[PDB]
Symmetry: C2
Subunit: 363 residues, 2 copies
């Protein structure tokens, strides 16, 4: 049964996930491996996420460093697992998104797959989003088909919910097509605030949020954002959720304590998920939570509250650690590419139809 | 007998070349197609070849336009030839280079291969240079292996010379492995000068050059470069000596290219019976005169004489490179590129 590596750096950017799966009758996780990303690499990536000078050269240099790190992680994992590269059929590389502009019909992942193949000695499948975009799609999210393969059940209406930077839900309804969409903010505003305020990369354990007090007025002005009304195919904020967007809202209201702002941001995520989810699937029996936000104890409470009809739990309860779900999916996408099975869900992305996603860079 | 399309921007960025080959026991050219490149697109590509603002967004939009054009040409060619896309195994896409810095270990060719796959319904193999550069190579030139496969001969010592911007040669000597290097400027300076002077893209048939007179003081100053190439570099050399007629500089520029070719080529392959010229410089009658004289003991002619039109050489090589990818055969000559060893070049974007 073939083995794959999945390689990603998400939108949180503290490091690189590497997973090893076996794709037999089902997808089995064999091993996991996390590397820290140097702070400099994280900032240089974030410096490419907004328009700037000399981007071609800058991106090429950044991408060399990102690939070097990935290959390093792959080497460490294989050695530690007593495995040779020849035991791995392919790497599925998510790359690093520096610009996602589906409305301008483009998405940009860097991560020089050719150099990744050179360094690793393993075939690499990368560049998964662009075929979806070329076919009129949003290029995202790409995890629903994997989610469906993992948790596709006729006996239960399930929502698979990834809380990364942004929140995306896969709606698995018995006797129906797979639906899904980015619900909006996950950790990203909470990351942005504690970063601006104190220089921390994220709010660990949602602790600083926990200390604060939700501001019902500010929350109402955030949830007032028209974005939430937008339905159907949607990816990574139809209103780019950022700190300039937040600060604009803050000034209008009275001066609030930072901790309260953090508590409000937490409630915003909880609320926007609940309502974007139940609106599309009121029948939801189970919410399977993955991504970093699955660790946020407070956030996980509020989801359970706001969705009383559904059982809300980490994917750990269904035998898949939440930290590794996205990487496992990119390993799976490498499999789908090699088998010429469709990677996208056209009803999720809004593409014209099913497509083979990715490109093969052979070792 | 698989069939492949080869795609690339043409000479002087005035259009796109598309070729259809059959890869049997040898490479056969079935058909050729040329599409003009809009002036906007040409200038927008050139505006990305130097560092500037908002490149990632600008490059995304330019490559959408470039891929739309390529696909338009593919469609035109296939209908005109009464062929289905299902008859073509793959497109080999050269893409469009906007930045080539092997010194900094990168090379950047745009051309959204997935969009091309989407629009043509044909598998695309692209991004040929990056694996060679990943392996410590220069990522160029990639045609030596093709030239060997095409015009390899046991009896004749050949030089296959491509005169694009720069003049790269493939030295085909019986019994020996293929060699290659850049002989200095091809059309790059001659295009740059008439562009600066008159806003023309190129000097057609080297007519303007042929109206002028060579300047020794300049020619010698130019040939004194330790390489033995751009507009500022030329104007620096111009400013030393006194005012000179534009046609004479253009004449001088033409001779610089001829001499650097003649001298470098004969230096590396003294026993050169035949020089097979291809690319845009092949149609520079004036330059082809001088080359014949400055290499008197060799037969100097375009690849037309040996069965393949000089215009389509490069496109045919990229179709060939799609073949090498799918067969998992090496596409580089690591002795020419400086790569660590043989590598399969490119990446497959399936329809
Ligand atoms: Cl995704
Ligand atoms: Cl080349």
């Amino acid at each position: 049964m073939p083995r794959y590596l999945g390689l990603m750096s998400g939108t949180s950017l503290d490091g690189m996930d590497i997973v090893l799966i076996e794709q037999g009758d089902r997808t089995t996780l064999l091993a996991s491996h996390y590397l820290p990303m140097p702070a400099g690499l994280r900032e240089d990536i974030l410096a490419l996420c907004v328009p700037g000078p000399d981007e071609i050269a800058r991106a090429a240099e950044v991408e060399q460093r990102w690939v070097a790190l990935a290959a390093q992680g792959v080497r460490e994992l294989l050695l530690q697992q007593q495995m040779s590269p020849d035991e791995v059929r392919a790497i599925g590389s998510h790359g690093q998104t520096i610009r996602h502009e589906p409305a301008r019909h483009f998405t940009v992942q860097i991560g020089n797959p050719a150099l990744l193949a050179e360094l690793t000695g393993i075939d690499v499948v990368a560049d998964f989003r662009r075929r979806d975009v070329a076919a009129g799609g949003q290029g995202a999210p790409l995890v629903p088909a994997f989610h469906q393969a993992l948790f596709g059940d006729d006996d239960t209406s399930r929502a698979v919910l990834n809380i990364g930077g942004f929140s995306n839900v896969s709606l698995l309804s018995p006797g129906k097509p797979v639906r899904g969409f980015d619900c909006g903010p996950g950790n990203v505003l909470m990351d942005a605030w504690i970063h601006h305020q104190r220089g921390e990369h994220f709010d660990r354990d949602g602790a600083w949020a926990a200390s604060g007090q939700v501001n019902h007025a500010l929350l109402a002005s955030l949830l007032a954002d028209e974005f939430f009304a937008a339905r159907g195919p949607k990816s990574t904020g139809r209103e780019r959720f950022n700190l300039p967007w937040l600060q604009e809202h803050l000034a209008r209201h009275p001066a609030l304590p930072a901790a309260d702002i953090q508590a409000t941001l937490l409630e915003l995520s909880a609320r926007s998920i609940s309502e974007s989810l139940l609106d599309a699937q009121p029948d939801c029996e189970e919410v399977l939570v993955c991504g970093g936000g699955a660790f946020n104890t407070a956030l996980m409470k509020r989801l359970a509250m706001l969705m009383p009809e559904a059982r809300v739990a980490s994917t750990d309860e269904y035998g898949i650690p939440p930290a590794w779900m996205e990487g496992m999916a990119f390993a799976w996408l490498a499999h789908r590419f090699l088998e010429r099975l469709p990677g996208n869900c056209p009803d999720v992305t809004g593409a014209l139809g099913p497509r083979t996603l990715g490109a093969l860079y052979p070792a």
